């Protein structure tokens, strides 16, 4: 029983701390849209009008109440901010809409170790799912005028058939929409408290056009000249999730009860936050995640189909019987078809865009070195031995805070567990 003399692959020590919390620019699994189908009102397309139209699809509003106060914050300024936006909408015709720079607005508009907590893995599982709606390929259909090899467009087009209804795709489209509206407002007003509706559009299970309202953002002042100059903002986001079941996830938020829906109470997650022309541009460019994940899908498919000396694309996507380990359940490791693979590799790329951080950039470069070293131990019956740097020390040092980074560690631990069991 002296394994204790041997150095072999242990898992990574994650940090002790109060449970990690949510920190993305907007809500993910917890989001709630009010929407309109076939929208055709006068001025459709125009955010503020579309928004007013989504707000009128709902009749359950009640008198706002704080229900999970932010504990750094002056909570009643967040009620007054909601109430203010509610008030300022009940009106008569213009395109955009600045808020009375009231007292509670002006206020609202201006390491510690934490441990892993389950909500993040649950968010990840939701991101990989199919939705009833599709989030790309929404226009009238036409030729692919665009010069691209046969097999490469076959792969691209198969992938799209698998990711177009993926929930991670809604998140890309949501970041694109919101960030680009934010850039627009930040540059037109600059001295204005513009009310910025959080929108996406999609097409439904039946094929209808649909426009969605997740909530609203108010911009602070936006005289920005460095790319790094910061726009404060307050985001207010509808949700049906009762923040009291997992109050640790909501530490950054004041949460209000604002209504009932068909029957559950309805919540508004509120928090202040900040961005810059560079972060907004990052959001605006979240379709790169479709690219990134296609390329890894394509090279998985290359590698395999070279072994078998035929193109396997068609057979992988259609028969759905080649599979790949990609998840775990109470029975051990589970394999899925190429379509779950595309959606999951999508979601990983989207999350690590939603949670970009230096801790991620470190963890992911160092852990790759260990990865290759553990696959070499695994794949070679006389593998030899390997020098770690302070590989463990370089990796483990990235594990401070970050919910996303900390799952990735947990996920890597799982792997080590199985790679060598």
């Amino acid at each position: 029983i002296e394994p204790f003399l041997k150095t072999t692959p242990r898992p990574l020590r994650l940090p002790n701390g109060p449970p990690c919390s949510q920190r993305s620019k907007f809500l993910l699994m917890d989001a709630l849209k009010l929407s309109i189908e076939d929208p055709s009102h006068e001025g459709e397309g125009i955010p503020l009008y579309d928004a007013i139209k989504c707000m009128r699809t709902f009749f359950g509003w009640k008198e706002p109440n704080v229900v999970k106060p932010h504990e750094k914050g002056i909570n009643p300024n967040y009620l007054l901010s909601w109430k203010q936006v509610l008030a300022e909408l009940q009106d008569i015709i213009p395109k955009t809409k600045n808020m009375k720079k009231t007292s509670q607005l002006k206020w609202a508009l201006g390491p510690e170790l934490r441990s892993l907590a389950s909500w993040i893995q649950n968010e990840f599982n939701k991101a990989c799912e199919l939705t009833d709606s599709s989030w790309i390929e929404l226009d009238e259909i036409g030729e692919d005028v665009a010069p691209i090899e046969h097999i490469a467009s076959m792969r691209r087009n198969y992938f799209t058939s698998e990711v177009s209804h993926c929930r991670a795709t809604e998140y890309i489209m949501k970041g694109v929409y919101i960030n680009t509206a934010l850039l627009n407002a930040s540059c037109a007003a600059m001295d204005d408290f513009q009310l910025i509706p959080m929108i996406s559009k999609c097409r439904t299970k039946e094929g209808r056009r649909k426009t969605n309202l997740y909530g609203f953002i108010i911009k602070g002042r936006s005289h920005l000249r460095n790319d790094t100059d910061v726009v404060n903002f307050v985001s207010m986001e509808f949700s049906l999730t009762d923040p009291r079941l997992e109050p640790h996830k909501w530490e950054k938020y004041c949460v209000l009860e604002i209504g009932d829906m068909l029957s559950r109470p309805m919540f508004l997650y509120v928090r202040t936050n900040g961005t810059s022309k560079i972060k907004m541009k990052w959001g605006m460019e979240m379709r790169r995640c479709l690219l990134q994940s296609l390329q890894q899908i394509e090279s998985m498919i290359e590698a395999e189909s070279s072994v078998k000396e035929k193109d396997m694309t068609k057979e992988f996507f259609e028969n759905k019987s080649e599979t790949w380990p990609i998840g775990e359940s109470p029975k051990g490791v589970e394999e899925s078809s190429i379509g779950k693979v595309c959606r999951t590799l999508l979601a990983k790329s989207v999350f690590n865009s939603l949670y970009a951080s230096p801790q991620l950039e470190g963890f992911s470069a160092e852990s790759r070195k260990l990865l290759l070293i553990v696959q070499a131990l695994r794949d070679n019956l006389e593998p030899g031995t390997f020098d770690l740097g302070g590989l463990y020390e370089a990796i483990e040092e990235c594990l401070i805070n970050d919910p996303w980074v900390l799952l990735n560690a947990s996920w890597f631990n799982s792997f080590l567990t199985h790679a060598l069991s």
Binding site: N125, S299, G327, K348, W411, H418, A419
Partner: peptide, 15 residues
């Protein structure tokens, strides 16, 4: 299932 995409590497040689 809990989805864990680093479990791919039980099968896919890190490209």
């Amino acid at each position: 299932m809990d989805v864990n995409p680093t479990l791919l590497f039980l099968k896919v040689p890190a490209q």
